[PDB]
């Protein structure tokens, strides 16, 4: 679509979410992924940590400053995973990669906006409940990431402000339900039209 | 929709009062037939309303070969008084049947559009 797609990274498997996001950006869609620290990877944590430590070992022996760049932030880790699923050495792939914005936590532009979910990449449906998984935030923290604590504090601040918004939203909805009861005689004419056509059961 | 003409073109009137569409020809391949219908039986569509009636007319370019003085006159197409009489005759007997069932004139008065939620293949017309 023409609008930006904002996806919540919590509870989403890394590769499965990256595959969906990669095809979306190749189709001209702007995608924003927030809470990349909440992304999950299947398999126990130690095993997934070994995979990144093996990644850390791959470096140019002659000059590591030129070699593979190992990004430790969860947002950049997810960004690199998507980059491995795009033709990033062509102009089409670079254009697609520039349509992806990745964030740790939820920054102020997107904290006030509704966030989508990809069921085909969710851990609850894609992974057996008895299997072990790893958190991208924990994996990032123990391999070099430096902002797990500050992101946690800011995410806790954001959650407190969101609860206040939800209580106002719930108070507004309660008032709307009371309003519907109050004006029922002057509404049943239009209520009946809605019911005949499947709206407002 | 009133009748199909001898060339297969459809004769349509959106009651000119309702949506400013006169008695006009149209092509069935470029229309969407909705399921809502009004009974226009026992109405009289005038006999002279044929393809020759609705066929376009032109002026240029007789008695004139070299174009130095513009022949762009007449371009204001004029509604023939016969066309107004025929439009008045058909509408006078279709409009009452449109007014019979509720809020059909308002339906004819609005235009059709695609909203970002709906898709044409999912729509029942």
């Amino acid at each position: 679509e023409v609008q930006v797609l904002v996806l919540d990274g919590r509870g989403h498997l890394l590769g499965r979410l990256a595959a969906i996001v990669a095809k979306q950006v190749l189709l001209g869609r702007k995608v924003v992924v927030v809470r990349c620290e909440g992304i999950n990877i299947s398999g126990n944590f130690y095993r997934n940590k070994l995979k990144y430590l093996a990644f850390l070992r791959k470096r140019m022996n002659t000059n590591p400053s030129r070699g593979p760049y190992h990004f430790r932030a969860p947002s950049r880790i997810f960004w690199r995973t998507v980059r491995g699923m795009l033709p990033h050495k062509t102009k089409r792939g670079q254009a697609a990669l520039d349509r992806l914005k990745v964030f740790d936590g939820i920054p102020p532009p997107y904290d006030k906006k509704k966030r989508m979910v990809v069921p085909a990449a969710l851990k609850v449906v894609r992974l057996k409940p008895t299997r072990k998984f790893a958190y991208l935030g924990r994996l990032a923290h123990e391999v070099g990431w430096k902002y797990q604590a500050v992101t946690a504090t800011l995410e806790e601040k954001r959650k407190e402000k969101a609860k206040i918004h939800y209580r106002k939203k719930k108070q507004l909805m309660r008032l709307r339900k009371q309003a519907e009861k109050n004006v029922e005689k002057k509404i049943d004419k239009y209520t009946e039209v809605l019911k005949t056509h499947g709206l407002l059961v | 929709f009133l009748k199909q003409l001898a060339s297969g073109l459809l004769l349509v009137t959106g009651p000119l009062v309702l949506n400013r569409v006169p008695l006009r020809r149209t092509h069935q391949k470029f229309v969407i037939a909705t399921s809502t219908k009004i009974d226009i039986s026992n109405v009289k569509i005038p006999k002279h309303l044929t393809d020759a009636y609705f066929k376009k007319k032109k002026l240029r370019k007789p008695r004139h070969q070299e174009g130095e003085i513009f022949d762009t006159e007449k371009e204001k197409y004029e509604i023939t008084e016969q066309r107004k009489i025929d439009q008045k005759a058909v509408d006078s007997q279709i409009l009452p049947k449109i007014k019979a069932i509720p809020q059909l004139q308002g339906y004819l008065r609005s235009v059709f559009a695609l909203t970002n939620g709906i898709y044409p293949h999912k729509l029942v017309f």
């Binding site: 309003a179 509404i187 499947g198 709206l199 | 809020q103 029942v124």
Partner: protein, 139 residues
């Protein structure tokens, strides 16, 4: 935690497959994945059926397992499921979802008009309630 159980006489709603949208009664169970399934009053003859296309309802019929279709129909007709089903919120949401899909262009226009007036009257009254509740002057 669990309230709805696969059992003999349990009425299930078919979500997809050749018999989607029908109600069936579970007559017997086989191999954990399939069940002997029979809807005599809903036009589903006895046959195997995966548990994946079933969605259990709250209705349980009383008949012995692997009983003949006649006894299942008698149990289905006595305390009839068809009328009880149609009265549930589950069924009338299915029906409401069906009539909304079959809504024509004219009906969409009239719904758009009714919704417009209904929302303006409701949203007026919301403002009035808000303004009224705003008069709170007390220690």
């Amino acid at each position: 935690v669990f309230r709805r159980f696969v059992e003999v006489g349990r009425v299930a709603y078919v979500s997809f497959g050749p018999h989607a949208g029908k109600l069936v009664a579970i007559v017997d169970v086989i191999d954990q994945n399939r069940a002997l399934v029979d809807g005599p009053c809903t036009q589903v003859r006895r046959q195997a059926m995966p548990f994946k296309c079933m969605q259990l309802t709250d209705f349980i019929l009383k008949f012995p397992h692997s009983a003949h279709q006649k006894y299942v129909r008698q149990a289905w007709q006595k305390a009839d499921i068809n009328t009880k089903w149609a009265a549930t919120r589950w069924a009338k949401k299915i029906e409401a979802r069906e009539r909304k899909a079959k809504m024509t262009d004219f009906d969409r226009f009239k719904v758009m008009k009714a919704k417009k007036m209904r929302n303006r009257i409701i949203k007026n009254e919301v403002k009035k309630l808000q303004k009224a509740a705003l008069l709170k002057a007390s220690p």
